[PDB]
Amino acid sequence: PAPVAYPFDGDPIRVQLPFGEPAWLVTRYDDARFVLTDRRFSRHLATQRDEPRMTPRAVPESILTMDPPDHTRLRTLVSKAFTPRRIESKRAWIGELAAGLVADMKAGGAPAELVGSYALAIPVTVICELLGVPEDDRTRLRGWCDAALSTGELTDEECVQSFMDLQKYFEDLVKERRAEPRDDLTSALIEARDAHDRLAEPELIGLCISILIGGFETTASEISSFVHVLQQRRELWTRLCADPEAIPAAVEELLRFVPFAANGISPRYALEDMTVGGVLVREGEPVIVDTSAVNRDGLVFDNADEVVIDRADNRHMVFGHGAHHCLGAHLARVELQEALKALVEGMPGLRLSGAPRVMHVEW
Numbered sequence: 546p547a548p549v550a551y552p553f554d555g556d557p558i559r560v561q562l563p564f565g566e567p568a569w570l571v572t573r574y575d576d577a578r579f580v581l582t583d584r585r586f587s588r589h590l591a592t593q594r595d596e597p598r599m600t601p602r603a604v605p606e607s608i609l610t611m612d613p614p615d616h617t618r619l620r621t622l623v624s625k626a627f628t629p630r631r632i633e634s635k636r637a638w639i640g641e642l643a644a645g646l647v648a649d650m651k652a653g654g655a656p657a658e659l660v661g662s663y664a665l666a667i668p669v670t671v672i673c674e675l676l677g678v679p680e681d682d683r684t685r686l687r688g689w690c691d692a693a694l695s696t697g698e699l700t701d702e703e704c705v706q707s708f709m710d711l712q713k714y715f716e717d718l719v720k721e722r723r724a725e726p727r728d729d730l731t732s733a734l735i736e737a738r739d740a741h742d743r744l745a746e747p748e749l750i751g752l753c754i755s756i757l758i759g760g761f762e763t764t765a766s767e768i769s770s771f772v773h774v775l776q777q778r779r780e781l782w783t784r785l786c787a788d789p790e791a792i793p794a795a796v797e798e799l800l801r802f803v804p805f806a807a808n809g810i811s812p813r814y815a816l817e818d819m820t821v822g823g824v825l826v827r828e829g830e831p832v833i834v835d836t837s838a839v840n841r842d843g844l845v846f847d848n849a850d851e852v853v854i855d856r857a858d859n860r861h862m863v864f865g866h867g868a869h870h871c872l873g874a875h876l877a878r879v880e881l882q883e884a885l886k887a888l889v890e891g892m893p894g895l896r897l898s899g900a901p902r903v904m905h906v907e908w
């Protein structure tokens with residue numbers, strides 16, 4: 546087919562992202578399950594092909610560009626450190642943090658700018674605390690944080706200097722924690738072993754960066770979009786004010802419902818010619834799962850285009866599937882649950898004044 550421009554039956558669609566080669570776009574859940582689970586699809590060809598992507602720089606090698614067995618080694622090592630216990634043990638604290646940020650907005654008076662004061666504030670502080678970045682070094686991360694969230698108007702060179710600054714900073718942090726270990730994720734990653742296997746210094750630095758960048762904008766955008774969606778369907782906001790125990794269910798359903806601009810899921814490359822949902826995918830061609838479409842696939846989700854908080858069997862793909870399923874999924878869930886909880890408890894009368902980049906709120 547002639548490719549169509551992406552971002553903008555059920556058969557895969559030929560698309561052209563802003564950069565890279567043309568790709569097949571998968572919109573059906575059943576098709577996506579194959580693409581993301583099966584060992585006949587590869588990520589590591591990313592770095593030998595011209596990867597469909599939103600930004601011009603060729604993609605750096607990372608945990609997200611690996612295939613089993615190299616990938617499995619990395620995930621095994623990371624799972625020794627990034628454990629569900631280490632995550633849950635932070636829930637109360639994340640809750641206190643969230644409550645404190647709501648109280649800070651209150652003390653400043655309406656209107657507050659929710660993106661900057663809340664949606665961005667929670668994940669950057671949570672990730673930093675987890676990683677062990679001290680408060681008096683967090684200024685080093687601000688450049689990236691601006692680069693991730695903006696258009697206005699960082700230079701090409703400021704972006705690359707701010708990303709290299711992440712490398713430089715995390716190199717220092719990894720050296721410091723190797724020499725003086727602490728109770729943080731960075732030290733636990735350095736200490737992780739699987740027999741004699743361990744993460745090399747460049748792998749540690751890369752993982753710290755992958756954690757920060759995987760957790761920051763994603764979590765931030767979802768907090769902002771959750772609040773937007775709940776405010777436009779205010780009957781749902783009110784329900785959560787009346788029934789804060791429904792928040793975990795509501796987080797799952799908002800994760801399903803909130804549409805991604807681009808592909809949150811990275812391209813997978815066919816290792817041999819295969820038909821997927823009726824189209825021939827050639828050896829070496831990329832296939833992109835559209836998270837938003839798959840999460841609205843009416844063959845799987847009844848009333849897919851409505852928000853149904855208590856939806857039974859809400860097995861969405863917002864965190865992907867298969868081997869590369871979001872390392873941070875549990876942490877993200879904790880952050881989103883506690884973010885919504887603090888807002889509905891602290892500001893049940895919240896309304897919009899004028900994901901979003903800026904979003905002003907009164908109460």
Ligand code: HEM
Pocket residue numbers: 608609610620755756757759760761763764767809810811812862863864865866868869870871872873874876877
């Ligand atoms: C709402 C928040 C989040 C969303 C929607 C999200 C989404 C995703 C998705 C879709 C993937 C798979 C990409 C693919 O297979 O191509 C992924 C992977 C990843 N996520 Fe997240 N994520 C979120 C939060 C986090 C957090 C808080 C962290 C870290 C603490 C994190 C770290 C990562 C990492 C390291 C990977 C790569 C895993 C691998 O390749 O094995 N994410 N995430």
Ligand SMILES: [Cl-]
Pocket residue numbers: none
């Ligand atoms: Cl042929």
Ligand SMILES: [Cl-]
Pocket residue numbers: 861864874
């Ligand atoms: Cl999941």
Ligand SMILES: [Mg+2]
Pocket residue numbers: 579582583584
């Ligand atoms: Mg299979």
Ligand SMILES: [Mg+2]
Pocket residue numbers: 713716717
């Ligand atoms: Mg140094």
Ligand SMILES: [Mg+2]
Pocket residue numbers: 790
């Ligand atoms: Mg109850």
